[PDB]
Design an enzyme around this catalytic site. Structure first.
Site: not given
Ligand code: HEM
Ligand code: HEM
Lengths: 137, 137
Positions: A87, A129
């Site tokens: 984060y 989480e």
């Molecule tokens: C407050 C902070 C964060 C927000 C608001 C956020 C937001 C999101 C959103 C909206 C999605 C997609 C969900 C969907 O429609 O399927 C997503 C997926 C993902 N986020 Fe985050 N994220 C946050 C922090 C992080 C962090 C710190 C990481 C670490 C690397 C991360 C890694 C990923 C990964 C690997 C995916 C999956 C992509 C997929 O296959 O959809 N996120 N995140």
């Protein structure tokens, strides 16, 4: 978050949303370049992180209102192996993106406000989480 | 919540907790005597006041108690709890805290608790509204 802080986020979030495309593209570009280690966890390129944070910030006073979405994003994060320690690095690149975009308007307070806001938003993700990771075993 | 409010809450919860049995019994007593209309919704209930104090000790990181909040929300939605019931519970809770604070029940301290109960109730109210919505699709 203090009241003044909340106030800065409320005043400035709409300027960030106006330049959303730049923030988003700059964020992801900087994230992957500077932190190559997270690339593996991710035309199909991720795009929703920054705007999702802005959406959270638009409701900085009522974060429980975005739980239904946070809950679902969390399932995807736990599935990908997102850790608490990721984060701060995302926050760092988001803030840098906000700074470049705000340009001259990028006062310290403004930046510091965004730093705090991100913190509180990230905390919700981190807890939900942590709780799902625990529920898995 | 300003910091002084938070400080008052963190300093005083322990007194209230030590006075738990009293706050609890006075709260349910007056709730049902002054608001007979909620009686039907509820071998007696006992967890309310102690749960608010617990949420208050965590007032700085509410996400940490989501898993409890969530499970309680289900019971509230199953029971027919409404947003407009919160102010009435808040009124009787504050009455009880006032009684136990005795001489320490300064204005300032009661106002802080008022504020704190508000923030905590707002979380439950939003969660339950989302669960009520979720029931119809
Ligand atoms: C407050 C902070 C964060 C927000 C608001 C956020 C937001 C999101 C959103 C909206 C999605 C997609 C969900 C969907 O429609 O399927 C997503 C997926 C993902 N986020 Fe985050 N994220 C946050 C922090 C992080 C962090 C710190 C990481 C670490 C690397 C991360 C890694 C990923 C990964 C690997 C995916 C999956 C992509 C997929 O296959 O959809 N996120 N995140
Ligand atoms: C922030 C405020 C509230 C808190 C912390 C709270 C807490 C709780 C807790 C811990 C339970 C028991 C769950 C269990 O162990 O099954 C419960 C149940 C319930 N609460 Fe609340 N409550 C709150 C506000 C209200 C309001 C506003 C009402 C409406 C009059 C209400 C009515 C009920 C009822 C009817 C039940 C079910 C009776 C039962 O537990 O069998 N609560 N609440």
């Amino acid at each position: 978050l203090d009241q003044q802080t909340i106030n800065i986020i409320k005043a400035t979030v709409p300027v960030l949303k106006e330049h959303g495309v730049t923030i988003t593209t700059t964020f992801y570009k900087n994230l992957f370049a500077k932190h190559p280690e997270v690339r593996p966890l991710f035309l199909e390129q991720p795009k929703a992180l920054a705007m999702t944070v802005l959406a959270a910030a638009q409701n900085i006073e009522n974060l429980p209102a975005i739980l239904p979405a946070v809950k679902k994003i969390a399932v995807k994060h736990c599935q990908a192996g997102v850790a608490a320690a990721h984060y701060p690095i995302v926050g760092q690149e988001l803030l840098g993106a906000i700074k470049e975009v705000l340009g001259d308007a990028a006062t310290d307070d403004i930046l510091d406000a965004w730093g705090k806001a991100y913190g509180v938003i990230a905390d919700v993700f981190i807890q939900v989480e942590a709780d799902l990771y625990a529920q898995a075993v």
